[PDB]
Amino acid sequence: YSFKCVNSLKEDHNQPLFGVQFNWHSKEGDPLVFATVGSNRVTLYECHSQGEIRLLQSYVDADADENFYTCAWTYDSNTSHPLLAVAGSRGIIRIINPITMQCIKHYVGHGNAINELKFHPRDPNLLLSVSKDHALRLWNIQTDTLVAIFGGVEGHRDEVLSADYDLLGEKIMSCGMDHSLKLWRINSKRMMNAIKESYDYNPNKTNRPFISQKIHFPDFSTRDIHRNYVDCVRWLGDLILSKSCENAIVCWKPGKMEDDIDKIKPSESNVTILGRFDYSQCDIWYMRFSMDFWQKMLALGNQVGKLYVWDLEVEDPHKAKCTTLTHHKCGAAIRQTSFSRDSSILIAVCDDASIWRWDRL
Amino acid sequence: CWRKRVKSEYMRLRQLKRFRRADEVKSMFSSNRQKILERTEILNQEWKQRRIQPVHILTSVSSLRGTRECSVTSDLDFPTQVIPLKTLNAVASVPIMYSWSPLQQNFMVEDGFINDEIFVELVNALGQYPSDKIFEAISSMFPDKGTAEELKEKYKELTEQQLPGALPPECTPNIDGPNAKSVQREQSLHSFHTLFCRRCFKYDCFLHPFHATPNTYKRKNTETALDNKPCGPQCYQHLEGAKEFAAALTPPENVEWSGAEASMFRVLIGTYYDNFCAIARLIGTKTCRQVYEFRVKESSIIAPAPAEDVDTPPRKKKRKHRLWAAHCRKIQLKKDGSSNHVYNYQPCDHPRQPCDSSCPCVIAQNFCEKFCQCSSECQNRFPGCRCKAQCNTKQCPCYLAVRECDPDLCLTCGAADHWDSKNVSCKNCSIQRGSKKHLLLAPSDVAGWGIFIKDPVQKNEFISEYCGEIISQDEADRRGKVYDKYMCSFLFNLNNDFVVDATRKGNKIRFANHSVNPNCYAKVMMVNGDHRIGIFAKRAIQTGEELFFDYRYSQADALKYVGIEREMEIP
Amino acid sequence: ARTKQT
Amino acid sequence: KEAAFDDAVEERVINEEYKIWKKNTPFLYDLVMTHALEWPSLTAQWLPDVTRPEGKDFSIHRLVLGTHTSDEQNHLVIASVQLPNDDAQFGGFGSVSGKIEIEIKINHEGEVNRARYMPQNPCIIATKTPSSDVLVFDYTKHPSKPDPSGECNPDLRLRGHQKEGYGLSWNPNLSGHLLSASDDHTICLWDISAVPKEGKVVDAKTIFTGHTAVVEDVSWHLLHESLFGSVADDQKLMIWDTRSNNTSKPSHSVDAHTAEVNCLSFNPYSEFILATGSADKTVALWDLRNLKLKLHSFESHKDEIFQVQWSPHNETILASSGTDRRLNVWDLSKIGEEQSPEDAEDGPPELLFIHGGHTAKISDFSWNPNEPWVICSVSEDNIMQVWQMAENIYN
Amino acid sequence: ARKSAPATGGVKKPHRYR
Amino acid sequence: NKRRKLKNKRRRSLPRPHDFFDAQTLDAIRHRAICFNLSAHIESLGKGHSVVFHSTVIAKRKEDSGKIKLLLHWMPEDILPDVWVNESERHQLKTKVVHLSKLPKDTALLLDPNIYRTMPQKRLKR
Amino acid sequence: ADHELFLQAFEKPTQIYRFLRTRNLIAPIFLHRTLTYMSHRNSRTNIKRKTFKVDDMLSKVEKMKGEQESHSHLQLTFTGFFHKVTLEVLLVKVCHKKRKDVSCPIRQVPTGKKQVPLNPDLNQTKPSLAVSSNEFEPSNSHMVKSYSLLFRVFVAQMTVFDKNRRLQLLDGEYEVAMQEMQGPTLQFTLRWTLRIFYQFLYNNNTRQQTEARDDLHCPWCTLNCRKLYSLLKHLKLCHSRFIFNYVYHPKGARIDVSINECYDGSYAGNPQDIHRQPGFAFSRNGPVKRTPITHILVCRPKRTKASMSEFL
Amino acid sequence: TYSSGHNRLYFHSDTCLPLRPQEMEVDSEDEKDPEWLREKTITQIEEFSDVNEGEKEVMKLWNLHVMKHGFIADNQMNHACMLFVENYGQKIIKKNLCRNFMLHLVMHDFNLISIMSIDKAVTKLR
Amino acid sequence: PPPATQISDLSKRKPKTEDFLTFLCLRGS
Ligand SMILES: [Zn+2]
Ligand SMILES: [Zn+2]
Ligand SMILES: [Zn+2]
Ligand SMILES: [Zn+2]
Ligand SMILES: [Zn+2]
Ligand SMILES: [Zn+2]
Ligand SMILES: [Zn+2]
């Protein structure tokens, strides 16, 4: 895939944007809209033909000095409206209704800064947030009930700074500052019961709070993949793609190659390192890669603004060459990237509050 | 001569190996791609079944004038865009709290690329094809290879997984299982004896190391009166042969004597030593006459039951407290002249040697509790309460130094009875019973998270024990370096050997803040052989009042960490 | 390792 | 909608005003004694008795309150407050934590709309119900701790109504005569002097149906045992008289206000003087001899006057509580007298105190006897505050 | 830095009459 | 306390007590303040404590006797009622400055939609 | 400290306090004349031996003195209409505020139809008259707030009776001005039968000197405190969002206004309501349970004198 | 100034969510036997390879019983074994592993229970 | 700048923009 640069925005606050997400829930025909979070500011943009980009909306947390560095899109299943969840240094989640132009929900309770937000692929109401408090919390945005907390005695011992649902939303692979990657299964019996009890709870008819599930023991854990801070994790189907300070995105798999992800035991202590993606000049941490919806291309940027796009449809992406898209006016550290649902457009953000648009072909 | 051939074969075998690995990863990638395609297809089909309302631009409607302006510029020809910027509604923030786990009891815890797969590949690949020359060559050129003697030994060996497997050296499965072969009583009970901790009755003790003396300790065998009574139609007595066998101890039949039944008979006879009626009753697959026959056969095989016991003749009206005080005075005047330190309690066992100056507990300046194997009348042991009232007074011995009331020693104070009821009269059996006061967690003053008391508590009343994970002092320094760099420490010094860390685990009382004038105080008490930290009210505390207790930091440390004193006009 | 920024 | 946004901004500014008043509290009062009841109280009336323990720097008073809950059980509670009888105080200003304790609770068949005690027998208290019946309770016949089983049997119940009521007042002269008014256009009377054979149920003796709208609180004449007033949504005040051989035409009928009139209080110290308050943000007082003429009206409330009560120990002093989150005390001895421009800027001369200590509608209030200037005001936001206006404001 | 508590108090002397 | 020393009003560093008046409400206040200043000129011509009204003639009246009068309408509209003034009032009462306290208390609430609001505007009870 | 930060930090409390200025000038929170430190306001003493047996006598005397006018007859006869076509006239009445509706009930009654020749010439007639009836009875006057009439040829509303039920129309020729809905005019005739300084500080780096004339008045709410002690007390109490320090100045006073970083601007209401989700928070839809608490914020203030030594 | 009662909003220790006033009355949210400790003891017991399946199940159930009831005294283990028989006895028969519990009873070598207690427990299990 | 007409400095900060009455108090530069 060949990409070309058609637009290069620059926000006025001149503060790093650590997050950008395309609205993958929009249908076909309605225009492409994405959100970039940085400083105390959340902005929405629209992508039009011939490189046209339009700044639609902007939200600011003018008090208490919030540093937004996460965003995630969802929809209201009852009323079909979009919703954008943002979180950052304060550890508070703000579900924003961009069509009514107001923050409709807050979720406080994370003991430290939140640096990743994920929405359940099969359930818009279920939201996952990792935080500096060494734990992952699964929130329900229909009823404001915290479904579960992922952490504790066998949870992460340091800042959880990434996680990802598997593509059917049956498990979460979490990575933290403890060089460890941990797997938590939602398809378990207790977690489905937790969702069901979260959907039928209302405080107005009971004197007890919602019984959140404390899940201290993950279904897998490994420190054999990376020797430094693992700052991003995505699911390449059943193979987990993991990224750390070492300049490589490592495609690994729990257990031996004979075992499958469904049958690995919590006590399994071996992994297969079946591939890695080589790049360079990305030593600094909290740089995140993001494959497109179809998981056929993988994008990442380095400290000098070189955007590495890999083709995951090749027979063996281990030896495959990258695209190393770059622009002479770039140079700031790319923070995060996002593809459109059709992946016809690729977007990126930098540490100098700039947004770069790349179009396939 | 043989160097190049061995090198060629090793390169070719490793080439085949990594070619196989590459083909395997190719197949794995292809299968994963197929799974991705299928699942993405079903997700995309799911996404096409609904409608999402498209978001539009915003214009100043509410707060028409006076709002902030948001703009984005472009390096290229596109015009600069300006839109009104709207403020999100404020949300009440919460203080910082890292993850921790609830605990009502302490939790003792302990303190280039290389892999073993390449060594196994070298062993099995070279082992399939004397052979000492190959090992000598592979050790000669390659600096990282060597120990050719072990390679030759492995080549001589089967070089295969010929081990028995998961079965232990003495296979003793569940007795109710179909393969429960007959074994010795110690062999059958070895796991329980090694794993059971007597100090808190937990198998694989959560706060006591398993490296302790097993159940093989001196004990009295006079566990029953050995009253003679007939058992029924089949009995160890009431028959001429049965009576003769019983008299001799103090014909066999081809019954279905399973290995499990024989092992269980051995186990029971190694604990009763005198009564075959009870053993026959407990084992349903045994006849009492056959029980006696097998007992006689086993006695003729190895040995009969010794049934040794002791009576401890010496006694006196005041043989518990006066000599206790004399012994304590002696040990204090010889070595324990000051209370500048306190050691962890560990039971001491001896081969009938007395608890002299060489005793680990006496040299540790600790009284032997019931867990010590010192003696039934060990003069160093703590006897218990004789007080018949509330044990909160400085005149009771157990309360006197720092100790709680042992529920098997202090009988009169009430620390024994009503074990299942909160209504107790000893008032010094609180931290053992977990009689914590209800605490609420809320963002406090002075600091971030602080603990609060629901109902009022009078002075010198117990508040929740400061639980945590018990660690060593070196590990304490290790993790306390990080905690100090984070300016948030939950470390509570327990004794000279251990220390309680409330960071990763604990209870609600871990949030209690510091104040030079506190409403609570903490004392490290000896609780049933364990040092535990109890939080007590320094004065009467009102409902909803925040709990503070002094951290007893050094002046510099106290000022630099917890220097917020909450008051400025105290004088 | 550390240094989130350049 | 814009209404929700205005409500939010109003909540912010109301909180700021409460902060400003709480900061300015010491210079406006000589006693402010706040309490946040676990459930809001629609009723507030001090019991007449006062206990003055020896050597204690306080006295024990009691309240007749209620619980209007969301879903759970409703109770008729009686509080116990400590007031600083001496000049020092009432740790704290007296007992470390004893200032307000609630030890009386009777299960109710609905929220306590109105709760008034019988002057000739304070132990028995009549109370209104959202149901169609009015029930009386004697707290000496019920346990201090409420029975968690459920409903509690009252002393007896009084019927004669068909829907919710708010009006209630006992006869201060005839021992055993009660008055009630409801959303039905009918005011009823009951003879509770002696009903042993009534079987827990006492039917209406006489029903007054003169009004044509929602009848609000009815108050007897303080000194005359046969006359009683009445106010209603008919925007008129009609004064009744018993033993008149009639049930539809009252003794008098004058168009009291321009809006629905919901207030009534005969002056205890005057034979012919009563005061009314209505939704027209005005408090009006008449004279029994000249009902055709309304001789004053107080214009300081902002939304709607809901409770008007006369101050005991003072003939010329009146208090009205409104939905404007303000309780006004009127010294009507200053009606229409000259004032300096900045004096008149604050309000009419008839005004000498605005109680800005509530951030919701003041549901009810009552001056207390045996203490010259202490009021208890309750609001819908669970906040009940016993307060005394500063001494130098009067005298 | 570790939170600390006061040390022991002692053991009762034998009872003896005046 | 009874007579003991009271606690200090400040110390080294206490935890933040939060601020209920957020920046969103402050932006609302700023918008409404600019609107009120543009309309009423409270902080420019009203001396901070008064709102100015501009009079426009609506009706011209000539009486039975030799006298004439004009009807006055005020720019902020319903905040003040229409009055009748003689012919000589022109050029002498074009703009009147009325104190915030002297404004009619019934129509002074129309100056601004936060001067007073019945907070539970929808009442489930009386 | 940047200047913009200083401006924002000092405009945050100024905005709210100046909004409160207006809000409490129209809807007071308390009477400033009843505050102990503005005893100069409300100069009238509290001494009174008032009796209730003379209220009726005084009211009757005043009513008899004021009982001057109790008066109460026209035909339409429509004419032209000045302008540089049909018309109707309506008698529009405004009722009083009710619980049922949030607005004053307004209603009009038809009384006929008219034709108005546009732009009549001078002396070309060969001014219209009104139509009146017994529509102003005292019984109806109690119901309705005021009486008025409406024109439409383009509307013009005219009031006949004031809020105090006082007649304001008299016998004469009127000329009203039309509205878009000089210029379009309708003509008709009818008959009826110490110089004190302030200093603003921020982080000890940004400083502003402001001398405010009309001194002894509160800058934030224009409250008149005739004494300097009263002014300082009002500033510290009513405007506690700043920290004020009184410093002696020749021929005046100096107040060092600085931001109060310790101001407790939290939500004084239910503590739980501040953590509710938007929409459900501050619902006021009904009762809420809350843990009881008792506050004694005033028991018996010492009531010292007006000493200037309280501020240094 | 003065206060009497709960002055602030309280939170849950485990979820950091606000504590409703209805939640304080009948809940301290701290139990003697947390679920994570039960799971930890299960995993720790299964981590050992020398012990057989019956031993693993015995230690499982005994540890769970002891953590639930929190026995701290030697003299309360006769009733502890009785309560184990009454409560978990149906689980032993379902597992058909009674021999390994009776084997657990013989404890007795630690001088914690009487031989009569062993006989009574085994009799009550059947 | 030290002069203030009535409250001019405080009246500068509130309508700092939007072409409000600050046009008459430009002396507070
Ligand atoms: Zn142990
Ligand atoms: Zn020992
Ligand atoms: Zn010993
Ligand atoms: Zn020993
Ligand atoms: Zn004792
Ligand atoms: Zn004891
Ligand atoms: Zn004791």
Residue numbers in the entry:
A (entry chain A): 80 to 440
B (entry chain C): 14 to 124, 164 to 181, 219 to 339, 426 to 746
C (entry chain B): 1 to 6
D (entry chain N): 4 to 93, 106 to 410
E (entry chain I): 25 to 42
F (entry chain P): 170 to 295
G (entry chain T): 81 to 152, 156 to 167, 182 to 223, 228 to 254, 295 to 322, 351 to 362, 426 to 544
H (entry chain L): 556 to 661, 663 to 682
What does the paper say about this structure?
Polycomb repressive complex 2 (PRC2) trimethylates histone H3 on K27 (H3K27me3) leading to gene silencing that is essential for embryonic development and maintenance of cell identity. The interaction of PRC2 with substrate nucleosomes involves mainly two structural elements within the catalytic subunit EZH2, the bridge helix and the CXC domain. A central mechanism of PRC2 activation is the recognition of PRC2-trimethylated lysine peptides by its EED subunit, resulting in conformational changes within PRC2 that lead to the allosteric activation of the complex. We discovered that H3K4me3-containing and H3K36me3-containing nucleosomes inhibit PRC2 using two distinct mechanisms because of the differences in their positions along the histone H3 tail.
To investigate how H3K4me3 inhibits PRC2 function, we obtained a 3-Å-resolution structure of PRC2 in the absence of JARID2K116me3 and bound to an H3K4me3-modified nucleosome. Overall, this complex resembles other PRC2–nucleosome structures, in which the H3 tail is clearly visible entering the active site and H3K27 is positioned for catalysis. Not surprisingly, given the absence of JARID2K116me3 as an allosteric activator, there is no density for the SRM and the SBD is in an extended conformation, both indicative of an unstimulated state. However, we do observe a methylated lysine bound to the aromatic cage of EED. We propose that this density corresponds to the H3K4me3 modification, the only source of methylated peptide in the sample. Indeed, the resolution of the PRC2AJ119–450–H3K4me3 structure allowed us to confidently build a peptide into the unassigned density with a sequence matching that of the N terminus of the H3 tail that agrees with a previous crystal structure of EED bound to an H3K4me3-containing peptide49. Our study shows that histone H3K4me3 interacts with the aromatic cage in a similar manner to other EED-binding peptides and is further stabilized by interactions between histone residue H3T6 and the hydrophobic pocket defined by I363, Q382 and A412 of EED. Additionally, histone H3R2, the only positively charged residue that is N terminal to histone H3K4me3, sterically clashes with the SANT activation loop (SAL) in EZH2 that is required for stimulation through EED7; as a consequence, density for the SAL is absent in our PRC2AJ119–H3K4me3 structure. Overall, the absence of contacts observed between residues around histone H3K4me3 and EZH2 explain why, in spite of its ability to engage with the aromatic cage of EED, there is a failure to stabilize the SRM for stimulation of EZH2 activity as seen for other EED binders that have been characterized as allosteric activators. Unlike H3K27me3, JARID2 K116me3 or PALI1 K1241me3, all of which allosterically stimulate PRC2, we show here that the engagement of H3K4me3 with EED is unique in that it fails to stabilize the SRM helix and stimulate PRC2 activity.
